[PDB]
Design a protein around this ligand. Structure first.
Ligand SMILES: [Mg+2]
Ligand SMILES: [Mg+2]
Ligand SMILES: [Mg+2]
Ligand code: NA
Ligand code: NA
Ligand code: NA
Ligand code: NA
Lengths: 248, 256, 245
């Protein structure tokens, strides 16, 4: 049933729009506007592609149209990016669309998609080095994330395996970015650890890395702006880190 | 990466030059004259300072000099604010705008103006003094986000100006300007009914003549390209109170 | 009508062949030879591909049938590498399009394109005067030239200023826009500079490249089209540098 197929894909649309905007409120609003457009003008929903691709195609139309807070530092960083490059990269990595599917969604051809992705990775080489804190109780995961962070040119403030170790580490050195698992070693939650750090140290971008990200993509309650799945591919971690970094 | 860094900063050099001149025309001409001076004399660029600071340091040398921009048209102040040139202390408006709207620290403003941090602080103190010598005007606020509109009103009132009212739609804005002519307009782009604050401003400008307009918007970079008609005065969202105060005083100099 | 479709692609074949040879006279002759071949031997022309693709395919077939120190370096370049690069960058052909044109596989096209991009790192830094009247464009061209490893002798924005700057430092390569700030022409500036300091390779930057590809009057050997991609400016400056000295 197409109603049920669209409903199943809405969480991922929220994931994508939240990553583009850095915000749950903006991302969830763009995802909702996409569904509204499809209900108001059903002819917008291409039936010759998969519902997932058709849904994201409509979202990219709304995304391109002027319309619908953000730090002025983030606004300056984002303003220097080549248009449509971050969209093509995120669609290709975190959303795992093939290059032809990406060309469909952005109403382009596959060779321009390849250029946009290549331009995305070029501008990622000019980015400044930041400091990243990792909240993760599985030591092999933490070590793997450290390797990815380092090869991106970033520094690690440290690894925290419990909420309390995380609140303590953030007090020693305010990170530029937090990578956060949910269930920690002492059965405390990375969600609480993050909330406590942010109350104390101000807004810092946070990427939650979790199995079943769908449970944080409902739109019904406060939820993260950046979500990577477990298991993860390295390309998805690099895209999320570079994306969240724009929001300092 | 100096070339890339200088080009990234050119939009902000336009913002600054436009505020000082009162016109997109002369401001864009002054910012492009700054870049043309660096390409002509690369040694003009200080590598010992950030590209942003070095760019603005070159701009201030040109601004202060007896010379004028060799541009496609005519460069200059704005005629309206010529009468205030006799009452204002040199380098005070420059120091205030650089340290507020342009977000330079007083040490970076000292470098830019080839001065010391203490002279810059006194220049900023003398700018705020001469702001008390300014007469009260009437400000119209076009803005649909009510909390921002309220906040803007508290700043305007705290500076001693009156507020004609707040309009949240293009239709409310054309009515408001007809009820009471404003000396200055603060305008957002996307209004409550999705109508356009640019369109609203143009309509007011037709009926009442030239009134200084300050556009308040996120991503001001999209109005700082010099590739199309664009505002002379731009405040960012989010803003700091000191930036709103520096933009309201600056634009008031160009009022009737 | 396939005759008109072929005619409309001739200017771009002249661009390609001129850049490969470094000379208007040779590039225009190679482009005409390609049309002549198709008229003489209609079998050469494949109707299953786009008329632009089929025309470049016939030219590559024909393509395969100065200064000793400059020839000594150009001889170290791997065969078919410059062609695959220029076809993919300035000619905006897709990898599969280039593979058809060279009667190769898209696999080999990337092997070639990579080898060419790697052999560009073995290039010598060179002086590059930029005659652009739009400062924003000049800054961006200075970025690509500097990243490639070349110096910038200067940036001029008027005919008289470019002629003056040529007197201070003889460039090895001139990037020249057609219409300058004082309504002067970069063509006249380039001609006056070359008349004085001798022959120097020139890459003309221009919106409207087709009106410089007629073959009916003296025209540039190398042309970058506004707007441009960095890969295009990089393929045009590497190609043109082969003819510097
Ligand atoms: Mg865990
Ligand atoms: Mg608004
Ligand atoms: Mg021009
Ligand atoms: Na669709
Ligand atoms: Na982008
Ligand atoms: Na997300
Ligand atoms: Na020639």
């Amino acid at each position: 049933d197409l109603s049920a197929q669209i409903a199943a894909e809405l969480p991922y649309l929220r994931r994508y729009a939240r990553a583009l905007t850095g915000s749950q409120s903006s991302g969830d609003a763009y995802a909702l506007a996409t569904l509204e457009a499809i209900l108001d003008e059903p002819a917008l929903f291409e039936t010759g592609t998969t519902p997932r691709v058709a849904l994201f195609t409509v979202f990219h139309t709304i995304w391109n149209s002027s319309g619908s807070g953000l730090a002025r530092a983030a606004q300056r960083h984002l303003a220097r990016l080549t248009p449509n490059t971050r969209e093509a990269l995120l669609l290709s990595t975190i959303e795992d669309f093939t290059p032809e599917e990406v060309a469909t969604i952005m109403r382009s051809d596959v060779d321009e998609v390849r250029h946009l992705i290549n331009r995305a990775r070029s501008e990622m080489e000019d980015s400044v080095s930041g400091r990243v804190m990792i909240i993760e109780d599985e030591a092999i995961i933490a070590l793997d994330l450290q390797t990815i962070v380092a090869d991106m040119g970033h520094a690690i403030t440290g690894v925290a395996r419990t909420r309390d170790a995380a609140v303590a580490l953030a007090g020693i050195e305010k990170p530029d970015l937090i990578l956060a698992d949910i269930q920690l070693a002492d059965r405390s939650s990375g969600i609480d650890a993050v909330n406590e750090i942010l109350r104390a140290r101000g807004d810092i971008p946070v990427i939650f890395i979790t199995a079943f990200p769908e449970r944080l993509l409902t739109g019904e309650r406060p939820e993260p702006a950046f979500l990577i799945s477990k298991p993860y591919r390295e390309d998805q971690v690099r895209s999320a880190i570079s994306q969240a970094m724009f929001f300092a």
